[model samples]
Target: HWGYGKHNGPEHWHKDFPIAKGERQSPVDIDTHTAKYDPSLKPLSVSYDQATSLRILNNGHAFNVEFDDSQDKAVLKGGPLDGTYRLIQFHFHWGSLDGQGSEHTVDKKKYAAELHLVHWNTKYGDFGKAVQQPDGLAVLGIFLKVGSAKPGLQKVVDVLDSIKTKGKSADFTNFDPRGLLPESLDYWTYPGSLTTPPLLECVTWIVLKEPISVSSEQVLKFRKLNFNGEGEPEELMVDNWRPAQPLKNRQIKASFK
Candidate 1:
């Protein structure tokens, strides 16, 4: 029941956390017909160098690649609409031993996993301080499905051997997340909140329509991650995805044809 389902999914999350019901969510079904078409809207560009400065941090739940804003590595310079925000940490949410990694499922279909590139408004200052601010966060949602082999992920998996244990990490120097992005940048943009706890509505969600594929082996390695620290009981982190929630009059705006 802890896995993603109707009664045990995001909706029931509010039961254990009443505050969850209040935060706006994402990865909702676009349905094409019901979506809002904004031909003028364009996605923000991210450079390879900007993404490479990230350093891998083995957080207990999963892997988090943190960006040091103080060093001026990555910056979210706010597009024509969304305000400027500084990139913070990027994390992956996947399933336990069976399902995918995405925290937000679309139309109840689970993918291999989802990557969240979390950013914070520099106006609030450093990452440690910005996290506490309500409007300081903005996240780019990238979906990963089990498809053809992705050469880019191989570079990431190459380093997996180093951080196999919970909270165990090695220096993942010279990494660029742009290499991880799908070739097609077509996406859906909307006003939403964070998918994690303390879900704040300040995040401007940009979910790419193109799903980057990876091998089953890659998915399995991701599932091997645990929430416990090293030497603790090994808890499977499979199927860590979140079921799709009600849109509630919220429009799934698109940047594609």
Candidate 2:
């Protein structure tokens, strides 16, 4: 199992999963000045049927809310994408402290946390098959800041206690993934990988410019979860984020000027 620790951290991931060193790696720094403002980019379009949300699970890496992608119940379109992408799961990347948890940075500014809504191109059939090909996944990245208690997020935080241990899962339905997004849909788009293991280079990243607010107390609750299962030594589920990767020859496109 790969981890964000000293020995099993991102640096060693390439040893086992060689794609970790792929050119189109994720968690890149979105430099506004460097990014191109593409007028041709369309506004992001999202549709999520609350019932598509299946369950929430903690897989030792991070907590994920799986969705029923049987149909286009939850899908993302437009904004640098050619076809419809079905939402399969959504998860978070955070840290021990509020100041440095987010995977992606804007103009080199990091947020308290980041929310990844993972979607796979419908043309590819399923996420399992889609993950292996380029232009197969489209991930929406929403930054989380520590401020007021976000009402929309309380429902998610309320369930953390039940799945505090790894491999634990519980029913979670009727939760709209769209509710967690910010008011502004403006974003920075680029090609990247899954911020986790196997580091597939199929993800088309659309990182929101504005961040949603969550209280400091709420963020602390995320740290209370354990990385290992009930029997292993207690390891807090924090700092579960990969460091930013080099931009290389990739060009970042902005949906708004």
List the candidates' TM-scores in order: 0.83, 0.98
Best by lDDT: 2
Candidate 1 ranges with C-alpha deviation above 4 Å: 1-16, 52-54, 77-81, 96-100, 106-108, 128-135
lDDT (tens digit, per residue) of candidate 2 on 55-103: 9999999999999998888899999999999999999998898889999
Give the per-residue lDDT of model 1 (tens digit) for 1-257. 22245456566666665656664665455556666668778666664365544467666656777666664466654332355676667777776533555655555556668888887777777665665665667677888888677776776676766676667777776667776788887777666766654455566777777878888888777766665566887766555555565677677777767
CA lDDT, every prediction?
0.66, 0.91
Q: List the residue pairs that clash in candidate 2.
A: none
* Candidate 2 wrong stretches, greater than 4 Å: none
Clash numbers, per candidate: 14, 0
Model 1 lDDT on a 0 to 1 scale: 0.66
